[PDB]
PDB file of C-alpha atoms in Angstrom:
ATOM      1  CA  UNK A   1       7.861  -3.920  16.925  1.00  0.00           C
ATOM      2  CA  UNK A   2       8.078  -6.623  14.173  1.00  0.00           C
ATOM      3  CA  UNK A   3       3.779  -7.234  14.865  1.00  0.00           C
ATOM      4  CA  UNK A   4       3.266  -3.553  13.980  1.00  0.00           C
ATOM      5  CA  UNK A   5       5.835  -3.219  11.016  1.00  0.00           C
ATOM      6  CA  UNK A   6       3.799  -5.809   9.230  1.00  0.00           C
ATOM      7  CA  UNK A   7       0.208  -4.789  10.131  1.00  0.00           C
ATOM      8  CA  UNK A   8       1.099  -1.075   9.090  1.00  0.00           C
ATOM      9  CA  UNK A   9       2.736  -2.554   5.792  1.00  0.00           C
ATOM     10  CA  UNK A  10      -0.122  -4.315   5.235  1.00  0.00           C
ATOM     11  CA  UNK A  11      -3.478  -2.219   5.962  1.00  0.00           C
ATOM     12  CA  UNK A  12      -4.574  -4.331   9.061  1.00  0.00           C
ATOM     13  CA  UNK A  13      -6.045  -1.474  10.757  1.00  0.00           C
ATOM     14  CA  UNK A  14      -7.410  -3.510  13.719  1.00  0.00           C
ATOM     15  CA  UNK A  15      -4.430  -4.857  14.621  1.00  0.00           C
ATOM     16  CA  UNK A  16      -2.902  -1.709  14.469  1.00  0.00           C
ATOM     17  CA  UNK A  17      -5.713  -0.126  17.033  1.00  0.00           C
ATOM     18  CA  UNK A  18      -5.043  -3.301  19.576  1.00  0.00           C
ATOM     19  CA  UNK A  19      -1.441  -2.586  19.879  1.00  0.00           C
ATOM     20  CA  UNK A  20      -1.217   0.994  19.445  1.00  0.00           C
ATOM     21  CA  UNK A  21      -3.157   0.912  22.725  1.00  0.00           C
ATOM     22  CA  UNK A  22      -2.512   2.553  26.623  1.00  0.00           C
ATOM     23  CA  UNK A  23      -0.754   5.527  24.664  1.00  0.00           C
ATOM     24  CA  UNK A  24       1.988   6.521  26.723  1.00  0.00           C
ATOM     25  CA  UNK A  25       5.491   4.930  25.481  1.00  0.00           C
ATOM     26  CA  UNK A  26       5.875   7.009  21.971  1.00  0.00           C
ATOM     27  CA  UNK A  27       9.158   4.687  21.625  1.00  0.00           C
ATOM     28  CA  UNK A  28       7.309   2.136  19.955  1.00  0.00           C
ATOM     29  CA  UNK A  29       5.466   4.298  17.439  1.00  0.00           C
ATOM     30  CA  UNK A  30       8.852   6.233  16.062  1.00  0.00           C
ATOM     31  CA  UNK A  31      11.171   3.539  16.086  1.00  0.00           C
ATOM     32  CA  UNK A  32      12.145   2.167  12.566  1.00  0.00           C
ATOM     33  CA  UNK A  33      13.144  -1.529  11.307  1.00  0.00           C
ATOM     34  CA  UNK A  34      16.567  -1.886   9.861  1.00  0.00           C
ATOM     35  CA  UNK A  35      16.140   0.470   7.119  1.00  0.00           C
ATOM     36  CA  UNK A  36      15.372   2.949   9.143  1.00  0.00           C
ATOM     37  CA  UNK A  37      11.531   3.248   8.102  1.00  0.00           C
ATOM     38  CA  UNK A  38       9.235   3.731  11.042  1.00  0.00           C
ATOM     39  CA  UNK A  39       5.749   2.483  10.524  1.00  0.00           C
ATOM     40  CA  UNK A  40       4.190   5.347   8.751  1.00  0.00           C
ATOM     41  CA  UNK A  41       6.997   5.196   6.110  1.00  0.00           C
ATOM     42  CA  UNK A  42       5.520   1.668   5.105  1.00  0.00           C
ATOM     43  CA  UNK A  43       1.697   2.685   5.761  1.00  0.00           C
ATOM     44  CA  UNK A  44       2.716   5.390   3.004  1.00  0.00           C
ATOM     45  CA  UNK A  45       4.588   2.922   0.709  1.00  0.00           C
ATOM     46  CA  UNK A  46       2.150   0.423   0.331  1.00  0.00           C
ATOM     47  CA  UNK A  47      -0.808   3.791  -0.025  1.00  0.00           C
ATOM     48  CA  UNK A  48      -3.213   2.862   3.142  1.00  0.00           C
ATOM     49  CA  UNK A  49      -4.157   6.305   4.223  1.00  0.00           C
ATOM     50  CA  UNK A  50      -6.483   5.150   7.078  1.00  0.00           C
ATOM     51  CA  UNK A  51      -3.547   3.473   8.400  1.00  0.00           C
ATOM     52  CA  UNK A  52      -1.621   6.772   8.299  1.00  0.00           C
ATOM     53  CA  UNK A  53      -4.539   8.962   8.938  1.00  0.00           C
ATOM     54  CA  UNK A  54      -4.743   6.739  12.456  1.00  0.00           C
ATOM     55  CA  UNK A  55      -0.817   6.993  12.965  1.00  0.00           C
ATOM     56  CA  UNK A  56      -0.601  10.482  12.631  1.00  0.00           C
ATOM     57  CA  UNK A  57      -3.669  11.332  15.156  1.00  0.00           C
ATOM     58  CA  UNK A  58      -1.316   9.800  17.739  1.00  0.00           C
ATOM     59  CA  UNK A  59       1.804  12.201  15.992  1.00  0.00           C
ATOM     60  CA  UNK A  60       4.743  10.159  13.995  1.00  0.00           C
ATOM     61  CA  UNK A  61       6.782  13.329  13.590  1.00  0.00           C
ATOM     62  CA  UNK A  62       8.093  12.866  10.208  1.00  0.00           C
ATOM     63  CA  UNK A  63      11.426  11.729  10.476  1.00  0.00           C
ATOM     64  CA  UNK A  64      13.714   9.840   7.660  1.00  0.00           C
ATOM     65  CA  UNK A  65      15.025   6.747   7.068  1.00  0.00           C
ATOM     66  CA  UNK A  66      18.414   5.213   5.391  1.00  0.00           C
ATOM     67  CA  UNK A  67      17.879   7.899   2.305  1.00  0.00           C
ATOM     68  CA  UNK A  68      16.502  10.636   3.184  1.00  0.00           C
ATOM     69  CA  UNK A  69      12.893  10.036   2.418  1.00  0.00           C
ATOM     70  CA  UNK A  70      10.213  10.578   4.037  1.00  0.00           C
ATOM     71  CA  UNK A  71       6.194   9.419   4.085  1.00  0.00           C
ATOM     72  CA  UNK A  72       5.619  12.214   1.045  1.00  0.00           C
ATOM     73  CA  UNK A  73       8.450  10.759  -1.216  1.00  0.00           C
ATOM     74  CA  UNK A  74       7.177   7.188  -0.488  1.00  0.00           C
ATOM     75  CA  UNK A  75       3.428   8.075  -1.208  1.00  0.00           C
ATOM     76  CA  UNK A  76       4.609  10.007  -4.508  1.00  0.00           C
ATOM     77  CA  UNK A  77       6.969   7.601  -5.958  1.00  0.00           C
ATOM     78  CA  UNK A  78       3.927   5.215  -5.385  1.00  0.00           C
ATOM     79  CA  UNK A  79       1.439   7.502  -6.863  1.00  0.00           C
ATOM     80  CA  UNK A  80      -1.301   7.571  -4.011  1.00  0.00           C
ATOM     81  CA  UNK A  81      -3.147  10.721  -4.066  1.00  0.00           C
ATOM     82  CA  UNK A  82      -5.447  10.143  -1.770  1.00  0.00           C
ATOM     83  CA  UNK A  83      -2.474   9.083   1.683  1.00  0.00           C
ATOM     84  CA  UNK A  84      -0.367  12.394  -0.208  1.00  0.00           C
ATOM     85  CA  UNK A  85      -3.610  14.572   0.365  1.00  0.00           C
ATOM     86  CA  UNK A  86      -3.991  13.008   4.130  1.00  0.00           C
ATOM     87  CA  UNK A  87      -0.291  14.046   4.823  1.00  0.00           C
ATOM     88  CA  UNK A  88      -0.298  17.474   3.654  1.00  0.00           C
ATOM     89  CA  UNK A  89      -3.261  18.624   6.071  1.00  0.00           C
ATOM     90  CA  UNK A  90      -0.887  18.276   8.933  1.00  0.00           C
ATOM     91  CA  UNK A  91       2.680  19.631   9.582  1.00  0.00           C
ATOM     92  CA  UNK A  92       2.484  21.290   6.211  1.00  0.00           C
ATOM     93  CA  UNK A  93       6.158  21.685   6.263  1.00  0.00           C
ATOM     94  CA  UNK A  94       6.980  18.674   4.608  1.00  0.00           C
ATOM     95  CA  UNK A  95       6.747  19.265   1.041  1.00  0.00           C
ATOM     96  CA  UNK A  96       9.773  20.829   0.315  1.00  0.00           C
ATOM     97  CA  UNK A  97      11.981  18.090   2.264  1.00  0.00           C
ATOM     98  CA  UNK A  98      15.027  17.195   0.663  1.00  0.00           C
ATOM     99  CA  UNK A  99      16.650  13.346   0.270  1.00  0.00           C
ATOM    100  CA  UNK A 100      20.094  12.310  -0.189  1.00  0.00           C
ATOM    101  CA  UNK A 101      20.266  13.872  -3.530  1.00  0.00           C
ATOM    102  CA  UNK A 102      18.392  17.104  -3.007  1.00  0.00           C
ATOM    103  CA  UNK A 103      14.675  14.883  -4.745  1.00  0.00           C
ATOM    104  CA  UNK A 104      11.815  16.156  -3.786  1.00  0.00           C
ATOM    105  CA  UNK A 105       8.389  14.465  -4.000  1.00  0.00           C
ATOM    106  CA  UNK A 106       7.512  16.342  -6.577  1.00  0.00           C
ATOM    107  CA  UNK A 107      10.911  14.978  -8.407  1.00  0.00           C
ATOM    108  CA  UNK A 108       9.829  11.158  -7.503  1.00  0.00           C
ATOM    109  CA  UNK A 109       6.391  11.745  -8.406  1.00  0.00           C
ATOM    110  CA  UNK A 110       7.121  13.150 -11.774  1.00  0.00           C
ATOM    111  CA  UNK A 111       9.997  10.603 -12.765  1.00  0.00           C
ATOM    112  CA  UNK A 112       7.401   7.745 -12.181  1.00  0.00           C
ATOM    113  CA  UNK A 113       4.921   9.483 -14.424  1.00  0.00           C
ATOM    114  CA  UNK A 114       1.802  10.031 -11.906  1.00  0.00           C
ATOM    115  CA  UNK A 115       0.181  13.158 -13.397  1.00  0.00           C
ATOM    116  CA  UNK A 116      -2.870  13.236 -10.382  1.00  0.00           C
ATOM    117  CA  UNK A 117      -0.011  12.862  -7.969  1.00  0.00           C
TER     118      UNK A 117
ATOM    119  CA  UNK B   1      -3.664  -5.175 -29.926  1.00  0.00           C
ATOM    120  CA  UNK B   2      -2.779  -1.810 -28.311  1.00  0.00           C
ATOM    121  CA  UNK B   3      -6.595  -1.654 -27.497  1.00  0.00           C
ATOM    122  CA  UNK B   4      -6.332  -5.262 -26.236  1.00  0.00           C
ATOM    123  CA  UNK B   5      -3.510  -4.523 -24.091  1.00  0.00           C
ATOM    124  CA  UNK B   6      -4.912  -1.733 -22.436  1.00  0.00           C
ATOM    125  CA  UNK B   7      -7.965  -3.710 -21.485  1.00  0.00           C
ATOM    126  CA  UNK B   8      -5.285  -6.412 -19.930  1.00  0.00           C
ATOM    127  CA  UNK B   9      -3.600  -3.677 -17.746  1.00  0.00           C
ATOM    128  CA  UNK B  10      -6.925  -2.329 -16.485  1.00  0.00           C
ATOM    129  CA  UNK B  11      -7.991  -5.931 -15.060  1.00  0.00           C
ATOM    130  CA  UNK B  12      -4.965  -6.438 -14.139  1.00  0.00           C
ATOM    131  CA  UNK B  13      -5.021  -3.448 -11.364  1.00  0.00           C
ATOM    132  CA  UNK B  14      -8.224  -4.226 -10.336  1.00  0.00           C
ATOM    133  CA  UNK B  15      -6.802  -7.633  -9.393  1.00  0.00           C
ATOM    134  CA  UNK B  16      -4.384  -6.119  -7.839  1.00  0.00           C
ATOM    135  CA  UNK B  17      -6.200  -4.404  -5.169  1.00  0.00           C
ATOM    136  CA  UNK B  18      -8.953  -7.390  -5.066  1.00  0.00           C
ATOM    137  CA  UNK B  19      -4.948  -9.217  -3.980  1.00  0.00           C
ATOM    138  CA  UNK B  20      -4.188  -6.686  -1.374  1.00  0.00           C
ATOM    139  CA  UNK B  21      -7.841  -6.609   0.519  1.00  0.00           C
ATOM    140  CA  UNK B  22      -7.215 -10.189   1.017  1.00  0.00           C
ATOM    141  CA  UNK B  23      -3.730  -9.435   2.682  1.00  0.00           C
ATOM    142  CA  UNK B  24      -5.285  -6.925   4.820  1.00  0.00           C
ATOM    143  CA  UNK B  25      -8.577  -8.962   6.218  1.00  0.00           C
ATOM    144  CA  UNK B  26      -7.172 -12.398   6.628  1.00  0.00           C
ATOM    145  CA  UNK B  27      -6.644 -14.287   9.702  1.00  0.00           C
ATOM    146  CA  UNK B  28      -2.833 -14.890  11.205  1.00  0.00           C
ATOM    147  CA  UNK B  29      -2.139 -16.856  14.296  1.00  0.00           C
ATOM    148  CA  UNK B  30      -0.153 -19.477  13.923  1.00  0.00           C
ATOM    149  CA  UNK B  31       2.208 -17.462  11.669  1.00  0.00           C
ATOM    150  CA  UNK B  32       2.061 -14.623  13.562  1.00  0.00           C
ATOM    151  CA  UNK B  33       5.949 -13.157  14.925  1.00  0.00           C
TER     152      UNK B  33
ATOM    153  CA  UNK C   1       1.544 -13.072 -31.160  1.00  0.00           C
ATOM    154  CA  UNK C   2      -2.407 -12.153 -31.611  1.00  0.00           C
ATOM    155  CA  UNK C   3      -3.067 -15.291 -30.455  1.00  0.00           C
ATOM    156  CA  UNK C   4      -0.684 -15.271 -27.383  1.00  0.00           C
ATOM    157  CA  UNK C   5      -2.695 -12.317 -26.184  1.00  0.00           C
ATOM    158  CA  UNK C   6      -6.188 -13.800 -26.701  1.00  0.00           C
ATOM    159  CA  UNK C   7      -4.970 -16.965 -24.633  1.00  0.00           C
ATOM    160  CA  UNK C   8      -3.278 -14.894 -21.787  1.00  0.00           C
ATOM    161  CA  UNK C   9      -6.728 -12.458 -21.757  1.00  0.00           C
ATOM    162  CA  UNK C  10      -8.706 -15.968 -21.628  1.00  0.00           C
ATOM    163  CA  UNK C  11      -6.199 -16.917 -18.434  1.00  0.00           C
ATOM    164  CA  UNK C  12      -6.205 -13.740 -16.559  1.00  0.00           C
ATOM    165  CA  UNK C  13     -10.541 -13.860 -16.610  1.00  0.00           C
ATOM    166  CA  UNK C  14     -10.272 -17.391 -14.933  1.00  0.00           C
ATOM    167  CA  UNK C  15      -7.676 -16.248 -12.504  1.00  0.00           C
ATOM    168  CA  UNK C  16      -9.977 -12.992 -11.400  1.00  0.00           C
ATOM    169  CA  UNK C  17     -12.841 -15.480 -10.996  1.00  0.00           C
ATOM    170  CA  UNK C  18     -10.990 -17.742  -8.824  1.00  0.00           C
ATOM    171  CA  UNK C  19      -9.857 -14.420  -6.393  1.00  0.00           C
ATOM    172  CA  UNK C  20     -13.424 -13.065  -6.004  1.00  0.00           C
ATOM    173  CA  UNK C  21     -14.452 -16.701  -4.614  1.00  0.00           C
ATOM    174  CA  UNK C  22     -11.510 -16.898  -2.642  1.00  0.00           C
ATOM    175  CA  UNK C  23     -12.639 -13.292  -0.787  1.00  0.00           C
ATOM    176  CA  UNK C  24     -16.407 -14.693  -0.908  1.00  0.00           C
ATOM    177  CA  UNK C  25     -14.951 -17.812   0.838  1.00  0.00           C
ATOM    178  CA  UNK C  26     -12.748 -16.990   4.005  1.00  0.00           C
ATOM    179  CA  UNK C  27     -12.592 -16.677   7.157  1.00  0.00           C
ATOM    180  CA  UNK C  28     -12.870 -13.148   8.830  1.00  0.00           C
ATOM    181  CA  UNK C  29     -12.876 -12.904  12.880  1.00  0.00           C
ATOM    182  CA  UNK C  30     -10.059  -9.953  13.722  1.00  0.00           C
ATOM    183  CA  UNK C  31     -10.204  -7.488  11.101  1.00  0.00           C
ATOM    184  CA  UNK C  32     -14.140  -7.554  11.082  1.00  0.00           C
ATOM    185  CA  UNK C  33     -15.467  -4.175  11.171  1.00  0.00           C
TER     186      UNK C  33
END
């Protein structure tokens, strides 16, 4: 739990492949830290797409943390097109998610001034 | 000095990232939790 | 304040030098691809 929170945050993909390993207990993968922010929610926030791109072959479902946010609004208030463009050729059904106060990403991405994004 | 600064923000992102390859190859073991 | 920015430019291009031997440098065993 605490191993993987910090190798997601941090892009250590190989230490992400040893643990994430004998793929049968999803409890790990969907469980979040005390803010509520499972590992792809930091993968996204610090903009390592490989890290989410391996996350999500094993399924992360999307869920939402402390405020309503979810990988999209972390990879848009950060501005990283390329982990946004690896998200939205998935569930699809994402991008018009809704946080505490009714932001989108496109809200987040625009307030931060990311025009690619 | 607008032109100047520019210049500083662009190396400073590419120092950035040089920063955050480092975090992601290094070597933790003792450290480790 | 001219001069302030020449100096912190002159700082910064040190710094990036010292990062790029730093990577060049380490140790890399785990996260080797």
């Amino acid at each position: 739990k605490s191993p993987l929170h910090f190798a997601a945050s941090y892009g250590r993909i190989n230490t992400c492949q040893r643990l994430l390993q004998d793929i049968s207990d999803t409890r790990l993968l969907n469980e979040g830290d005390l803010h509520g922010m499972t590992p792809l929610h930091l993968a996204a926030k610090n903009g390592h797409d490989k890290v989410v791109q391996l996350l999500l072959k094993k399924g992360a479902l999307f869920l939402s943390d402390h405020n309503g946010w979810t990988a999209l609004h972390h990879a848009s208030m950060g501005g990283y097109t390329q982990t946004m463009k690896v998200i939205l050729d998935t569930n699809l059904k994402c991008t018009d998610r809704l946080d505490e106060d009714g932001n989108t990403a496109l809200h987040f991405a625009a307030r931060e001034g990311h025009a690619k994004a | 000095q607008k032109y100047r600064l520019k210049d500083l923000t662009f190396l400073l992102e590419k120092q950035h990232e040089l920063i955050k390859l480092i975090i992601q190859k290094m070597e933790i073991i003792s450290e480790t939790e």
